[PDB]
Structure formats: structure tokens, C-alpha cells
């Protein structure tokens, strides 16, 4: 993330972090249940084989409650393709259940119609991660959060060089130096309604990070709720 | 209005049926006796920041 704040303890407990063979964080994830993690499909090409870390809040000091889980099954969207970043979604089912604690608590899946009229109509949502701290910058050590206004789809489309499919949406800022960045990809964009935080997007892509006149592009989750449901029932 | 006004006062999901408002709740919540508020079925419900 570029800009924003740092997540006080227990305020971003649905954050997961995928870690490679070198036990190093390269993509985010979102905890959906004791057993399921939500992520971006393209993060699967950024590592040969990986694991998931919950409750981490700083890479140097062990805060007690961190814990790492093996992935049992990967359900990658069939129609994801590398050249367009369409369908940038995948779900992981673990070999072991994450046990909820202080700082690991799942984020909510909504019901599609209500989310689309009530969640996607809110002014902003909340993105988070350990990803780089500036556009050509270094990966962050401590976990950070960011409030990103929803950017309407028309203005979005006009700001970008590439196609913005309906399985994507815009959030962030025109000129202001705040955005997600590489290493945050796959992690959570949640929208709050009456003090509950529902998964509304996956960090997917963007033109640079914080670029002036460019926003962040997220997998539109509601467009994939049914597919997510079916993955949990197969 | 119905779902337009305070979400039909549902806490979470609001859906229209029978030209009236029908609340639901997310998994790990159950809908209260009053048909709108949502009660946690467990100690770590989804979408809730952890406190001490």
C-alpha cells in the first residue's frame, strides 16, 4: 500500500499472507472461515509452492498468535488469463483449520443483491496488506490499511488504458499519493455496513501505484459470490 | 421506504418479498426474534474487529 495508516491490533484480523518456500510474504489473502482463504488468481504464478500465515502483524517480532497453514486445495477461476487480469480470483482450502483468536477473525461474505445496492453504493471501502510502500518501492514489514473511495465505473474506464471488465472495479485516488501496490495483490478490500466488514473486492492490478490520474483495480467479488459458493460445495 | 429506509431496518441483509421487507443475516449469525437484528451464534463472528 502507498500511504494510509497501520492497522492497530485486531482491527484487520481477516488478513492472510501467502508465503513462499523462503517463508517470505508475496501476496495477501482474506480469511472467509476456519478453513477457507480468498485470494487473487495471478498470485499463484508468483510462487512455485506456498503456505498461508495468519495473525502476523510485523515480520521481525513474533507476537505469539501468528500461525501458518498448509494449503490443501486450490480452486483457481477457470477463465483467468494472464494478459487481461480478468477473473482475478482463486480460493484456497487448507489442510488445517485456522483457529480464530485475537487478530484472526474472518471477514463476511454478503448476499449479492444487497451487497450490490448497499455495499457498492457506500463511498469507500478498506484495503490492506504487507505490499510495497511506493510504486517502485520496498515491501512493508508491518501490516497497513487504506480507505479507498469507490470510483465510478465511467470515470474509471476513462482514466485507464486497458479494458475494465464488469468483474473489476475502481477504488482509490486521481492525484493523491495513496493506493495499493505490488505485494498487496490478493489481499482484502472490505466494505463496512452497520459495523460489519464484508469482502467486496480482491486486490488485482493497477497502473503503477499511486500514479497521478490512475486508480486501483480490484476483482469485483460480488460478481464471483456464486462461484465462491459453488467452490465450497465441490 | 422499505429497503431504501435504514435498509428496511434490517441489520444486514434486506430483501423484498410480498411488498414487505425480509431481513437475513450472514453465516454465523442468526436473525433475532424481532425479524431484523442479527445475533452471534459463536464467539468470533465474521466481519467484526477483535477487541479485548
Amino acid at each position, epitope marked *: 500500500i502507498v500511504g494510509g495508516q497501520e492497522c492497530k491490533d485486531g482491527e484487520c484480523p481477516w488478513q492472510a499472507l501467502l508465503i513462499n518456500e523462503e517463508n517470505e510474504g508475496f501476496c495477501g489473502g482474506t480469511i*472467509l472461515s*476456519e478453513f477457507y482463504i480468498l485470494t487473487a488468481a495471478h498470485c499463484l504464478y508468483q510462487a512455485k509452492r506456498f503456505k498461508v500465515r495468519v495473525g502476523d502483524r510485523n515480520t521481525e517480532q513474533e507476537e505469539g498468535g501468528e500461525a501458518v497453514h498448509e494449503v490443501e486445495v486450490v480452486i483457481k477461476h477457470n477463465r483467468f488469463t494472464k494478459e487481461t487480469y480478468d477473473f482475478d480470483i482463486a480460493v484456497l482450502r487448507l489442510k488445517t*483449520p485456522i483457529t480464530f483468536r485475537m487478530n484472526v477473525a474472518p471477514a463476511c461474505l454478503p448476499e449479492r443483491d444487497w451487497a450490490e445496492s448497499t455495499l457498492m453504493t457506500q463511498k469507500t471501502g478498506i484495503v490492506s496488506g504487507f505490499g510495497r510502500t511506493h510504486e517502485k518501492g520496498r515491501q512493508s514489514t508491518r501490516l497497513k490499511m487504506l480507505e479507498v473511495p469507490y470510483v465510478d465505473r465511467n470515470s474509471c474506464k476513462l482514466s485507464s488504458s486497458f479494458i475494465i471488465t464488469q468483474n473489476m472495479f475502481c477504488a482509490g485516488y486521481d492525484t493523491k499519493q495513496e493506493d495499493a501496490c505490488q505485494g498487496d495483490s490478493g489481499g482484502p478490500h472490505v466494505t463496512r455496513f452497520k459495523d460489519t466488514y464484508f469482502v467486496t473486492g480482491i486486490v488485482s492490478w493497477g497502473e503503477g501505484c499511486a500514479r497521478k490520474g490512475k486508480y486501483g483495480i480490484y476483482t469485483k467479488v460480488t460478481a464471483f459470490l456464486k462461484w465462491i*459458493d459453488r467452490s465450497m460445495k465441490t | 421506504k422499505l429497503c431504501s429506509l435504514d435498509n428496511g431496518d434490517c441489520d444486514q441483509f434486506c430483501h423484498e418479498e410480498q411488498n414487505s421487507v425480509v431481513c*437475513s443475516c450472514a*453465516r454465523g449469525y*442468526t*436473525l433475532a426474534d424481532n425479524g431484523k437484528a442479527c445475533i452471534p*451464534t*459463536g464467539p468470533y463472528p465474521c466481519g467484526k474487529q477483535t477487541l479485548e
Partner: antibody
Amino acid sequence: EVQLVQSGAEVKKPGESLRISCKGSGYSFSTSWIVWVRQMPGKGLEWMGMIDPSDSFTSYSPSFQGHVTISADKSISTAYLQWSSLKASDTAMYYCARLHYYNSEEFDVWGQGTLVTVSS
Amino acid sequence: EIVLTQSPGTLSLSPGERATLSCRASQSVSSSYLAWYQQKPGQAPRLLIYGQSSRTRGIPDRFSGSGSGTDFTLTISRLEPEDFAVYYCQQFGDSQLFTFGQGTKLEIKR
């Protein structure tokens, strides 16, 4: 009040077809899978299959596939269980029950049951 | 597919006592945790408790569940006249769908 209400007891002969119904009220029917459950007389519960009423997607128990049909009519919030050709062994109580969506593994609301009798 | 074997077939107890019902599952390559149901004569099954630690609304805190892997139990701390019935465990695996135990009859020891 959310309810599942099933149609009443049926009495049929082998070889006849039959359709029983299961009506949801007090919630959006489309938003939950609807499962059917068998209970042979004096016996235990048997899961038969389920349907997603939003798109009528169905999944049958292998033990029951080809012997029964699950269907739905979302305009009237009703699910159905149908046999083209009954056997005496279909004599049992049949329940409908709601299966939530993303991560449910259990049935929160049950219909009152439908008694099915198959006999010459 | 996971076959669930509950035990005992019939449990004979007195009002006031604590009850323990077993269910053992083939913890396959997946598995997880189980849901449990109560059923009284002439009534539909009723969901009591489920998942790692969820409870249906209205279930008194005398009802609790535990176990993991292949071994699970449900415990009732203090039996009420209204508590005597058949109990079913129920599993799901993602690839494996749903299965039930064979039931335990909770009867009054007199």
C-alpha cells in the same frame, strides 16, 4: 417468520409418478439451497440431494441419482421432489430443509415432513 | 465419503444426569467438524449445535460439543424431561457431500 411448509401425505401404487412440494416463506427462497432428506419408517435420516433455486442447480446423492428429481419454481418459492416410477421401498417420510450458502454445512430450518405411502 | 458411527445405540439415563453421545468419522484427507440434531416423536429434526463452536439460538448452555479428526462428542450437563429424544450427528466433506449417524435414543432410566 421463516418457514418451510410441505404438502400433505400422499398414498400411491407402484409405477405411479408423484411430485411433493416444499414452500419457503419469510426469507428470500433464491438465496439458500434447499435440501431433501429421507426417513424410512423406523429408520434414520438419509440425504438425497439439493438445489440452488436461483438457477435450479442440483446435486444428488449417488445413492439417489436417477431415482428422483429435484426441481424448483422460484416464482412461487417452491421446491419439488418427483418420481416417474414409484417402488414400495420409497415408503418414508420426506423432509425439506434449508442449506445456507458460502460455508454452511448444516440445515437450519426444516419443513414439517411429507408422508409418502407406496403399496399395491 | 465419510461413514459416521454413533454410539451407543440407546443411552439410558435419569433426569438431572450428564449425557455424553459419541460420533466417530473417517477423518479422510479433509473432513473437519460436525453438526448435531435432536428429534422427538412426530416432529421434524431440530438443529442444536454446529461447526467449530456455533450454537443455534435458544440452545441452553448445558449443550456443548467437542472433538476433532475422527472423534466427536455432544454433552448435556443436566437432563430435563423435555431433553429425551434421538440425536444425530452429521458431517460434510467438500468433495464427499453430507452423511448422518445412526441416531442415539435418549431414554429415561426409571
